[PDB]
Amino acid sequence: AGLSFHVEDMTCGHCAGVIKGAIEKTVPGAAVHADPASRTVVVGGVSDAAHIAEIITAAGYTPE
Numbered sequence: 001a002g003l004s005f006h007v008e009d010m011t012c013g014h015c016a017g018v019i020k021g022a023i024e025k026t027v028p029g030a031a032v033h034a035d036p037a038s039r040t041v042v043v044g045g046v047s048d049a050a051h052i053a054e055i056i057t058a059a060g061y062t063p064e
Helices: 016-026 049-058
Strands: 003-006 032-035 040-043
Touching: 003 049, 016 032, 016 040, 016 049, 040 049
Parallel strands: none
Antiparallel strands: 003 040, 032 040
16 A cells, blocks of 8 residues: 556566665665566655655656
8 A cells, every 4th residue: 555656668577676776775675566567666665755756757758
């Protein structure tokens, strides 16, 4: 029961590693699970959504 982000234009298998590490590194404890197969990134527990959104955009994978 955390935050969910969905990106259609996200290249799969080349983003999950970046986004997962990027969020987890700055957000300790909270578990980050990125699934490029579903094109969805989920962060459990609690996290600043604004910071995650900057991370996803910074990785260059934003939705239409």
